[PDB]
Amino acid sequence: CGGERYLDFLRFAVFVNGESVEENANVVVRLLIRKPECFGPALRGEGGS
Amino acid sequence: EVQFLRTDDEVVLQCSATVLKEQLKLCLAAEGFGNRLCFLEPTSNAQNVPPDLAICCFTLEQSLSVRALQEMLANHRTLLYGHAILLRHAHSRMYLSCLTTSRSMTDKLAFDVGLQEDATGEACWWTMHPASKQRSEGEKVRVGDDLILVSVSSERYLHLSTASGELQVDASFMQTLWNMNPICSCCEEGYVTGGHVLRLFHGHMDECLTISAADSDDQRR
Amino acid sequence: YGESLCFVQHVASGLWLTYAAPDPKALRLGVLKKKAILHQEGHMDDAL
Amino acid sequence: MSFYAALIDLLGRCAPEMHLIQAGKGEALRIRAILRSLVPLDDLVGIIS
Amino acid sequence: RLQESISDFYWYYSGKDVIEEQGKRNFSKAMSVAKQVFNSLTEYIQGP
């Protein structure tokens, strides 16, 4: 529940007027992969469904 | 005097693992011909079983900043943290790369680490990052430092995986500390050095030390 | 003071003062503390 | 379900625009490759099905 | 840190044939700061 609320904020930061803001999109993706736990128990890599 | 890693130097990528409370040191190795994938050669038992170091040596060909790498991709330096390095396999003359395939079943987000025939593309470039707060970006990389290698193309760490029963190296999102132990920096003309392949001649270039030919009765021993 | 880098060694055993390399899954607990141990090899950043 | 739907929505909006991919920009291609690795195509079809 | 930033800025315009107006203005202010740092370092050691 808490994670979804932060996800939609990043949705508005990277997508403006129907186009993707590449400056923000690249930063968010790199930040997300540096902390893989942001993807939930799934998409965890090892031991993750 | 503090040793600094420079280009054209031969190094070995060495990591550490825990096996039955024992610290086991492993070197990244690859055959090149017939098998592109990289494996781990143990070296802690070199007293009793010599490791196969002929396929563990890599040459630091280039070391560039991220912007310089981007510019050169569109078209003896000292190693600095945050730079991108190009590792060439000493034996097969191939380049260490983050392969797009994945033979592991435990990690779905991991990629195989292997050798690439050419240095083209960004899949064969790795960025060095400090493992601890002791070193910062832009500082010189010193011998014995723990490094964090990140693939430029895949944004994944050079990871040692212990999920299976064996020890395997792959490109995952979990970091792993590596040591770039130097092998040789600069060799004078002539002046035999360790790790070379040579012949031992007896007299005036007439007889040389050798074993029996193939399919011989003495089992070539 | 503040310039010399010192490695602490136990005289009787020869062990070096270093950290314990904290096990993962403990970072979520907020434990930035690293347990100090005496080890035969240690690490390169053991200087104090 | 809402978390992963929000997560997939965020990653989808982080994808580069078509004109960047057609231009062959290296950064755009790298980002799309990372996104494809995170979310396999078969899982997308399975959820829709 | 300033030198590394200037080096990165050069690589950004290395491919481009001509540096545009905004890039030149940012280069000018970076050089002005670099002049002061060099002058400050010079004042530290002179005397000598």
Residues of A in contact with B155 (CB under 8 A): 30, 33
CA-to-CA distance for B57 and E8, rounded, in angstroms? 31
CA-to-CA distance for B99 and B110, rounded, in angstroms? 10
Question: Could you tell me which chain B residue has the CA closest to the CA of E3?
Answer: B138
Axis-axis angle for helices A22-34, A2-14 (nearest 10): 150
Find out whether A3 and A11 touch, Cβ atoms under 8 Å.
no
Give the bridge partners for B106, in sequence order.
none
B73 touches chain D (CB under 8 A): yes
CA-to-CA distance for A10 and A5, rounded, in angstroms? 9
Question: What single string gives the DSSP state of each residue in B55-72?
Answer: GS-EEEEEEE-HHHHHHH
Residues 6+ apart with CB under 8 A from B84: B63, B64, B65, B66, B69, B125, B126, B127, B152
| C-alpha dist (Å) from residue B14 to B11, B19, B56, B125, B183 | 9, 16, 9, 18, 12
CB contact under 8 Å between A47 and B163, yes or no, is: yes
Find out whether B80 and B135 touch, Cβ atoms under 8 Å.
no
Give the amino acid at A45. Answer: G
- Long-range contacts of residues B14-20, Cβ cutoff 8 Å, at least 24 apart: B14/B43, B14/B178, B14/B179, B14/B180, B14/B181, B15/B40, B15/B160, B15/B169, B15/B176, B15/B177, B15/B178, B15/B179, B16/B177, B17/B160, B17/B162, B17/B167
What was the resolution (in A) of this experimentally determined structure? 2.5
CB contact under 8 Å between A15 and D16, yes or no, is: no
D45–chain A nearest CA distance, Å? 16
3-class secondary structure, C38: strand
Q: Token pair of B84, please? A: 């991108």
Looking at chain D, the number of H-run helices and the number of E-run strands are: 4, 0
Q: Token pair of C43, please? A: 């690490």
CA-to-CA distance for B170 and B111, rounded, in angstroms? 6
CB contact under 8 Å between C41 and B23, yes or no, is: yes
Quote the distance between the C-alpha of residue D13 and its chain's center.
8
Count the residues in chain D. 49
CA-to-CA distance for B32 and B52, rounded, in angstroms? 14
Q: Token pair of C28, please? A: 């979520």
B81–chain D nearest CA distance, Å? 22
- Which 8-state DSSP code applies to residue D44? H
B109 touches chain D (CB under 8 A): yes
Give the bridge partners for B104, in sequence order.
none
B108 touches chain A (CB under 8 A): yes
From first CA to last CA, the distance across chain D in angstroms is 15
Q: Which technique was the structure solved with, according to the deposited record?
A: cryo-EM
Q: Token pair of B184, please? A: 């040789």
**Residues B164-196 as b or e (16 or more Cβ within 10 Å = b):** eeebbbbbbbbbbbbbbbbbeeeeeeeeeeeee
CB contact under 8 Å between E11 and B138, yes or no, is: no
How many C-beta atoms surround the C-beta of residue E8 within 10 A?
13
Three-state helix/strand/coil letters over chain A: CHHHHHHHHHHHHHEECCEECHHHHHHHHHHHHHCHHHHCCCCCCECCC
The H or E element spanning position B26 is strand B22-29
Find out whether A25 and D31 touch, Cβ atoms under 8 Å.
yes
